[PDB]
Amino acid sequence: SVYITVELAIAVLAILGNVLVCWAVWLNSNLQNVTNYFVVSLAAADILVGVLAIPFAITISTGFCAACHGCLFIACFVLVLAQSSIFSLLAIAIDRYIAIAIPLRYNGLVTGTRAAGIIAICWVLSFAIGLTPMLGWNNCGQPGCGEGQVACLFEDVVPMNYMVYFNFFACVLVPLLLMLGVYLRIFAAARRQLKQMESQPLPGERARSTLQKEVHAAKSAAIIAGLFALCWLPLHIINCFTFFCPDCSHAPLWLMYLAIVLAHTNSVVNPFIYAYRIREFRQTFRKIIRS
Ligand SMILES: Nc1nnc(-c2ccc(O)c(Cl)c2)c(-c2ccccc2)n1
């Protein structure tokens, strides 16, 4: 009952943390910029982890009996929250690039309305993708609980060809390659901005101070995304060994949960990465707690 205890411990922090983030954004209007509309989507997504994903994960770990639909939802619900984070992390990356690349058109393109629009779409695409195994791409009853009910075991009810090709490579690796590729242009151009401002016949510390603050936000966003791949790669790497190499000793359970717990930890680091990186956030929280 140790794994259970740890998972429960995470669920609490995941809720408290991201809920605090959502609250701080609703109180302080200085945090209600278009950029943080996506951060909220990240919060809500990372809240449902400690609310549903973790509860489901602890349940499916021991395995139960239920229909194919009910078994798939509980098993593929984490694929939804993890996919929604992909879009959110990608949007934030693009956003932080649009500001530095084109500061003028930034306010013209990046609107508070389009933000809510994109978010909605991302969630819809997240359910479509995350619950693709429910569309028929599953191993329900492939060569106990009785007719109708199926032994709900993640590896037995969820195809591996999906988890690898469709899910990992296409819906995770590719995005993380686009994101990384984005940050490549961001900092490459950001340093060019400083060079052009290094050969300017005027001080203009307003542009420098703003640029450095736009870069500080872009860097903070890079750290958030970096921790995502850092907490999910190990879990996918494990599945790449099992699939591509049937000979390769199937990953043990004590090592399996560690990669699963590692993924559940990602939802927790955000609230703390905001309080640390953003001086505006930490002070907002500090007020809420006291009062
Ligand atoms: N073999 C295997 N086993 N369990 C999970 C699993 C299940 C529920 C969860 O809540 C978490 Cl975090 C992980 C994954 C897995 C791997 C990559 C992406 C998503 C799931 N792969």
Swiss-Prot record:
Kindly report every residue range on the membrane side named Extracellular. 61-71, 138-159, 245-252
Mode of membrane association: Multi-pass membrane protein
Where is it mainly found?
membrane
Keyword annotations of the record? Cell membrane, Disulfide bond, G-protein coupled receptor, Glycoprotein, Membrane, Receptor, Transducer, Transmembrane, Transmembrane helix, Ubl conjugation
Which post-translational modifications are recorded for this protein?
Answer: Ubiquitinated. Deubiquitinated by USP4; leading to stabilization and expression at the cell surface.
| Spans traversing the lipid bilayer | 2-26, 37-60, 72-94, 115-137, 160-184, 221-244, 253-276
Quaternary organization:
Interacts (via cytoplasmic C-terminal domain) with USP4; the interaction is direct. May interact with DRD4. Interacts with NECAB2. Interacts (via cytoplasmic C-terminal domain) with GAS2L2; interaction enhances receptor-mediated adenylyl cyclase activity.
Q: Describe the function of this protein.
A: Receptor for adenosine. The activity of this receptor is mediated by G proteins which activate adenylyl cyclase.
The name this protein goes by in its record: Adenosine receptor A2a
Its source organism is Homo sapiens
The shown chain, on whole-protein numbering, covers 7 to 305 of 412
